[PDB]
Each structure stands twice: as structure tokens, then as C-alpha cells.
Design a protein around this ligand. Structure first.
Ligand SMILES: Nc1ncnc2c1ncn2[C@@H]1O[C@H](COP(=O)(O)O)[C@@H](O)[C@H]1O
Ligand SMILES: Nc1ncnc2c1ncn2[C@@H]1O[C@H](COP(=O)(O)O)[C@@H](O)[C@H]1O
Ligand SMILES: [Mg+2]
Ligand SMILES: [Mg+2]
Lengths: 173, 171
């Protein structure tokens, strides 16, 4: 897949950053190469339309690297994007949940029954995405799927999110 | 009418995060696809009319600037480089105080021309640090842009002589 190759060639890996043991996957080059970024968004959008048809109401982007992809993915799908932030950043009444640290969402971000897909750059343990799903569930929204560019399969984040479906463009151990 | 589509989706919260201030919340712009599209289109039209073919990259500022940078870059046919809170980026970096921002040393080459984007200009401290970092890579900052500007805080003056443009102004 030519388009998927355009994304994979723009992920750079940094052993022992930010601490010894972690291999950091840097999506910065995907953003810098407009063909790579277009490919990533298109692949995610095609998957989501093929899987959910017209059932998605909103994309939810996760602070902060998910913000890089959420609005462009939403736009490609003809949808709005809602924000899930690190605690302390949002005005108005909020709910919050531990993700490791805490994520937060505005109490009026969604109405009950609205259907949402969550996007982040990378799934590791699944703590961050799981916190997002908890918050969305507490607004009585339905999480249709979580998606990312990168998935670290040895950390079993997919299993943590089950039964919420998960999809990634690229997998590393 | 496009600008109206953006203005009508800014929501103002008094006394957040401290008493006396008004927080301008861009969340409803993001939530309404027509409003977001209008905002990106107005910024892009400004930048093309002002700079023609001179822009090489957009630089988006962590975190809310990340919401607009990539879409703006895509609309202009350009890539987007990232300026982050210190500690977040791998590899060789430069940093600048103001809290600290950081950029990867290979983000830009000497001579490359960039426009910086963030959601809101207040005191101008954040954008000023971004411009400092970019100048230290020997990049040229053509302009800084935002959706919202708080004019009583004199951010524009802080940035001078780097040009600045906002879609919307509040005291
Ligand atoms: N190895 C890694 N490289 C880059 N980002 C990471 C890495 N591990 C975790 N992250 C970031 O942390 C979150 C995923 O961690 P987790 O909550 O364990 O799934 C995402 O928001 C990622 O941006
Ligand atoms: N009144 C405000 N409402 C919303 N965001 C603000 C406000 N003041 C400052 N900010 C944020 O802080 C940064 C600008 O602060 P400054 O460095 O003073 O220009 C931007 O990233 C804004 O998102
Ligand atoms: Mg993250
Ligand atoms: Mg900011």
C-alpha cells in the first residue's frame, strides 16, 4: 500500500526517550510532509466510513498530539471535532478521569446517544484512550471506535479498550 | 458571512481561570464543521494574499495551535512543523523561556520561511518565544496569526517587528 508506506517512512524511533526503556515513536515527520499527512488522514477516514457508514456524529481528539489529527479527520468526514483535555484547561463544568494524571471533558460536550470516534497519535497501555472512553460514557455517548496512527502491540492496549473496537495504521512491538 | 460563522461560535466564560478575566473558548468552532472550515479558509486566504509563494512551512504551537496548524498547512499545500512545551520532543533541541517551549534542531533549515499559528494571542509571550526559537534555527518568521486577539494586552506590540494577523479582536 503506497499511501501506508508514505506514513511508515515518516515515523522516526528514538530509543530510551524520554526515559530508559521507552522507544519513542515520533510522528513529527508525518506532519511536515504534506503528502504523508494527507495519506494518514485519508487512510483513517476510509477505514471509518467503510466500518461505520453514516453513523458517526463526532470525532473526539485527545490532548495534545491527537489534536494534530482530530480536526483534519473530522473535516474529511464532514463532522465536528470535540476536545478531551488534560485537567485544568477547560472552562465551564467538567468531568475528569485518571489516565495513568487526569483527562477532562466539558459536561455539555455531547448529548446522550451521540456517536463518537476517538483519535490519538499512538496507543500504548491504553490508559489515555480508556480514560477518554470513560468520560464519553459518563455523558452517555456511544464510543463506536478508537483509532490511532501507531499501536504498540506488546502493551495490550487493544485488550484494555475491549469491548470498544480499535484500529491502527501501523503496529510495532 | 464567513467571519460571522466563526464569531458566532466563540463562547466567553467570565472569571476563568481567575476572577476578572474572560476566557474565549474556541471549542464550538471546532465542533461546527462549517465554522472550522470558514476559519481555516479565512486564514489561508489572508496568508496567500499577503505572502504569495514565500511561505515554506506552517509552525503550530502546543497545544491549541495544533488544532489549526495542520489543517491550515494542508489548505496551503504545505507541511506543518511543531513547537512544543519543553520535554516533549526527542533528538537535539533548542528551548526558550517566557515555562519553556522547544523545537527540534532539524525542524527547519537556515533560510526557510515560516508562519506561526496559535488559537489566541494574549500577552504575546508564547508567540514571542516561538519566534525566538525559529530565529535561532536561522528561519525567517513571515507572520504570526491567530483566531483571537486580546487587544488590551498589547501582544501585537510585543511581536513587532514580526507582522501579526487575527480573525477576531476582543478588548
Ligand atoms: N512510545 C511512545 N512514543 C510516542 N508517544 C507515546 C509513547 N507511549 C505513549 N505515548 C503517548 O502517550 C499516550 C499513549 O499512552 P497510553 O496511555 O499508555 O496508551 C498517547 O497520547 C501518546 O501520544
Ligand atoms: N483569555 C484567554 N482565553 C483563552 N486562551 C487564552 C487566554 N489568554 C491566554 N490564552 C492562551 O495562552 C496563549 C497566549 O498567551 P500569551 O503568551 O500571553 O499570548 C495561547 O496559547 C492561548 O491559547
Ligand atoms: Mg499524547
Ligand atoms: Mg497554547
Amino acid at each position: 500500500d503506497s499511501e501506508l508506506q508514505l506514513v511508515e517512512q515518516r515515523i522516526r524511533s528514538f530509543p530510551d526517550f524520554p526515559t530508559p526503556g521507552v522507544v519513542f515513536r515520533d510522528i513529527s515527520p508525518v506532519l511536515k510532509d504534506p503528502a504523508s499527512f494527507r495519506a494518514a488522514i485519508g487512510l483513517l477516514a476510509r477505514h471509518l466510513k467503510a466500518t461505520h457508514g453514516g453513523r458517526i456524529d463526532y470525532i473526539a481528539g485527545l490532548d495534545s498530539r491527537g489534536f494534530l489529527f482530530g480536526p483534519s479527520l473530522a473535516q474529511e468526514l464532514g463532522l465536528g471535532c470535540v476536545l478531551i483535555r488534560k485537567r485544568g484547561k477547560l472552562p465551564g463544568p467538567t468531568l475528569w478521569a485518571s489516565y495513568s494524571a487526569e483527562l477532562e471533558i466539558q459536561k455539555d460536550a455531547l448529548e446522550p446517544g451521540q456517536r463518537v470516534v476517538v483519535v490519538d497519535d499512538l496507543l500504548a497501555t491504553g490508559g489515555t484512550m480508556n480514560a477518554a472512553c470513560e468520560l464519553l460514557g459518563r455523558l452517555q455517548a456511544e464510543v463506536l471506535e478508537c483509532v490511532s496512527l501507531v499501536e504498540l502491540t506488546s502493551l495490550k492496549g487493544r485488550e484494555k479498550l475491549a469491548p470498544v473496537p480499535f484500529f491502527s495504521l501501523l503496529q510495532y512491538e
